[PDB]
Amino acid sequence: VRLEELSDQKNAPYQHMFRLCYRVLRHSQEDYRKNQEHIAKQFGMMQSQIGYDILAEDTITALLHNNRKLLEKHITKTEVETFVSLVRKNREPRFLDYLSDLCVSNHIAIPVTQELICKCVLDPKNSDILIRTELRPVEEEVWLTWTDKNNEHHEKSVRQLAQEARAGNAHDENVLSYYRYQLKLFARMCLDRQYLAIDEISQQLGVDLIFLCMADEMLPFDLRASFCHLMLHVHVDRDPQELVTPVKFARLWTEIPTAITIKDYDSNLNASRDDKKNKFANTMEFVEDYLNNVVSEAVPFANEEKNKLTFEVVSLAHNLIYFGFYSFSELLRLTRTLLGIIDCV
Incomplete structure (x- = not known):
């Protein structure tokens, strides 16, 4: 039997057999460390069978869900290379999503796997599966260049890609999703201040470029949200920024003014x-304008696509505020906007 031919009516019963086998494997490793470890030794075969209608994806997700030690033990360079090869062959965003899930476990970054994935992906090789972003005078416009599965180059502007996707162009829609x-x-690789990846991703996607992409209202809301997330996790959270304590308990006598x-x-x-x-002055201005626009419209939470961007902007504002980028007057002016946003209708 062939994996690509499993879809045939002749091999239909084999599909059911394999599905039942994978269900048995999933049920036999639920909340049992010994069984989880025993099944983890066959990870290579499961990856080899990933992609087809066999529930291997679900089995892998269940096995690696909220298991930090097992993830660290059984995810290594071989597994990352296998995922890279699979994504090279298929060019589907699902494998990138799987790599992102491997990067972070239980909403907490795993440094070992993060570093492994960064080394395996950002290496000079395997550059044909990553879309390169550049600025062109055309003021300046953002252009994406990528290599198709046929080793053929393609270059196009983000605005044109979005326009074609809105029109209905499936190729451009898939490119945008990828x-x-x-x-x-x-962003997942750069999560929790992964300087190894930040130092290389900042020089590719700059603060000005990300701000322009966010401020470009003609681009998809999900794309803008992704750019905002990248800004938050690649530029805002770095060495110079540090958490601040709003309340000070130690005071110096002569530094206290007579009137404040x-x-x-x-x-x-x-x-x-x-x-x-x-x-970040432009970023703060954009955040304030976006929040005012959101609060100026009835039913702020009506479109999920806009809600994603709103959540990303609110997260960025939270990080900036907790990093002490706002003054007391600015906070007092922003509190009215926030309360109006979360007010009753």
Whole structure:
């Protein structure tokens, strides 16, 4: 029997047999470390059978769901290379999604697998499965260049890709989906301050480029949300940024002014904010404008696509606020907008 021919009516019973076998495997490893480890020794075969209608994807997901130690033990360079080869062969975003899931377990990054995936993906080889983004004077426009499965180059503008996808172009829609999944993979790799991947992804996708992509209202909301997530996890969370404590318990006697106002309180710490907000000033302005636009429309949460971008923007604002990028007056002005956003209708 052949995996590609399993779909035939002649091999139909074999499909049912294999599905039952995989269901047995899934049921035999539920909340049992010994069985999970025993089944994990056959990971290569399961990957070899990944892709076809055999529920191997579900079995792998169940096996690697919320098992940090098992993931670290049984995910290695061979597994990452197998996934890279599969994604090279199929060019489907599902394998990139699987790599992203491997990167993070239980919403917490796993440094060993993150580093392995970064080394295996960002290597000079395997560059044909990643879409390259560049800026062209054409002010400046964003262009994507990618190699198809036939080793043929293709170059096109993001605006044109979005226009064709909206028109109905399946090729451009699939390209956009692949790009979104690639951005998700990069964000997962850069999660929890993975400098090994940040140092190489920042030089490819810059702050200005990501801001332009987010501010381009003609692009898909999901794409804008992916770019916002990348900005949050590649640029905002880095070494210079550090969490701040809003309340201070230690005070110096002679530093206490006789009279204190909102302006004086803001100016007390307006040097570090002033000299660190230069990069993110445009981002903060965009966030404020987006929140005002959201609060100015009835039923803020009506479209899921826009809700994704709203969630990403709110997460970015939360990170910026907790990194001390906002003054007291700015926070007091933003609280009205937030309350209006989450107000009753």
